[PDB]
Amino acid sequence: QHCPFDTLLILDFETTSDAANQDYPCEVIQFAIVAYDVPNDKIREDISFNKYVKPVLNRTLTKNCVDFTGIPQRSIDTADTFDVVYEQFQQWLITLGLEEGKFAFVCDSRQDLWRIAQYQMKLSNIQMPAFFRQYINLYKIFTNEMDRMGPKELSATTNIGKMNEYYDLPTIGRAHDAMDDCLNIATILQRMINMGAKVTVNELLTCCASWRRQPLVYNKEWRSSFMDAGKIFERVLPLVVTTIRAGDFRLEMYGVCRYCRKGMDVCGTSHQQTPHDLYKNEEDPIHFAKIAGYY
Amino acid sequence: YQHCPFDTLLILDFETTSDAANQDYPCEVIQFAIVAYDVPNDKIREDISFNKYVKPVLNRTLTKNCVDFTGIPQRSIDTADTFDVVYEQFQQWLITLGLEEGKFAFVCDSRQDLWRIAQYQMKLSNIQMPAFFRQYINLYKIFTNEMDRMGPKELSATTNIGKMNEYYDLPTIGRAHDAMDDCLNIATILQRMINMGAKVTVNELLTCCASWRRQPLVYNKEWRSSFMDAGKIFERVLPLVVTTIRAGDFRLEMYGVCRYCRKGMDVCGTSHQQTPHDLYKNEEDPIHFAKIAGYY
Ligand SMILES: [Zn+2]
Ligand SMILES: [Zn+2]
């Protein structure tokens, strides 16, 4: 109906972390997808991908990480590295015969594709594919929907939590298992569609933004603030998030950078707005940028 | 006369990667520090020292709690060499000193530095454990005996060094858990001990075999949050085991032959002699540090 895609792929990544430190080189440790069949309004749990991933930079999971994600150490010690798992994902995609630009990924925020996929793919030396450079931020649709229908007082802290609370849906499994997150998002998505939401891509990864032309005002305590760390990532990572209105999106924008209008084979091979102003303080280096090779 | 049979003592400290709340952790050396002590002249030689940061390979990012404990900033390890390089620099620095084989010994504040940390790091780096790490002076054990001689006090300090400074009434040097400040504290403590009657000699030896590793360990499921219980499993995982020797029983000629198998230390220690297969059965609860190190 409203959704121009015939299939939606709900995606979730879990990463290595250390709660108290934002200057951390997050590596994917779980990669999960569930398919949603748009014309039939059906969640297809039988069409799914669920792999653990062995990190190479930080091989031992932090305790706060395992408490948060619920992933135990054993599951990543027996896992393949990202480059192998991503290849399996590419292969699995092919064995589903979807048409380029007729499926889109759905996430609960900008974190999975703008930050996590982008950063992991630098580590693994993989080109950001066109299907990650265009996606549905479900939480952005949700806030438009709240605005459209009627805001109410929410006490949940996570994106998934609030959406579940607002639509009055029971929490599935537990927070932060990648597959459980996927199922929650899928059930929310379905509900949003039944209530008349237009679910379509709303975020695009772009080589440039005029607001990056102004040097970031450096907050020296950024390493303990999620918001302030976000500002650093925005500058360090090549691709930036540009929003698009539902009515302005077209399926033919697939594979085409919204900013420079070139194909995504040419756009994205090198950073067009390298933050040299952040890179001259030898006294206070940005660890995640150093270890990935941004400088 | 001189109760200490060595001509020079090497005070060693390691700092490692860590994650306070998890003891199933592949500790990697991130600081390697040494200060020399001249025995016949009773002098701490602060000018004869080794002090290097080390870049880990398995856990390249220090946890915040590791940073807070050791005081080591991330930038200092990002710019450092890996253990194999730093260890090679140590070997080279050692030869510069011009020391007679078996006439110098290492000094630590516990069994941790050489029994656990060095042994483990050296399995990761694939370096053979040297003779001068397989016999050493555990100063805290000597300290423990010295308290029986002179009479015990009620100590409130919490670290081994803190205790030793408290008991002998010495001021704390620098900051705790900086490898070099620890070395300086240990050297000063050592000096006081010898001057106050202590018999300072090799008291600990690393051996390939012990009868108490024949009987499978009484497995504690919650071992990962307990320092003592994790020690018990490290004792089984690590090939070489700590064996104590009385002061009057040590002989210089014990370098570098194993107390159990009586073979040179170039032959002993290549292969675990008491592999704890009983511990390696359950793929639903595996020992992480034993797995990444390649013990199974
Ligand atoms: Zn572009
Ligand atoms: Zn032996």
Curated annotation (Swiss-Prot), chain A:
Exonuclease activity is inhibited in vitro by pontacyl violet 6R (PV6R), p-chloromercuriphenyl sulfonate (PCMPS), 5,5'-dithiobis(2-nitrobenzoic acid) (DTNB), aurintricarboxylic acid (ATA), 2-morpholin-4-ylethanesulfonate (MES), 4-[(4,6-dichloro-1,3,5-triazin-2-yl)amino]-2-(3-hydroxy-6-oxoxanthen-9-yl)benzoic acid (DR396) and fmoc-d-Cha-OH (FDCO). Interaction with ssRNA is reduced in vitro by PV6R. It is an enzyme of class 3 (hydrolase). Keywords: Apoptosis, Exonuclease, Hydrolase, Magnesium, Metal-binding, Nuclease, Zinc. One of its GO terms (molecular function) is DNA endonuclease activity. Pfam families: RNase_T (PF00929). Gene3D superfamilies: Ribonuclease H-like superfamily/Ribonuclease H. The keyword Nucleus does not apply. Changing E14A: Reduces DNase activity. Abolishes DNase activity. Residues 9-189 form the Exonuclease domain. One of its GO terms (cellular component) is cytoplasm. Its cofactor is Mg(2+). GO terms for biological process: apoptotic DNA fragmentation; DNA catabolic process; exonucleolytic trimming to generate mature 3'-end of 5.8S rRNA from tricistronic rRNA transcript (SSU-rRNA, 5.8S rRNA, LSU-rRNA); RNA catabolic process. Optimum pH is 7.5 for DNase activity. Most efficient at pH 6.5 to 9.0. Reduced DNase activity in acidic conditions at pH 5.5 to 6.5 or in basic conditions at pH 9.5 to 10.0. InterPro entries: 3-5_Exoribonuclease, ERI-1_3'hExo-like, Exonuclease_RNaseT/DNA_pol3, RNaseH-like_sf, RNaseH_sf. Probably binds Mg(2+) in vivo, Mn(2+) ions are found in the crystal structure. Its EC number is 3.1.-.-. Zn(2+) binds at C207, C257, C260, C267. The keyword Metal-binding applies. CDD domains: ERI-1_3'hExo_like. Changing H176A: Reduces DNase activity. This is 3'-5' exonuclease crn-4. The gene is crn-4.
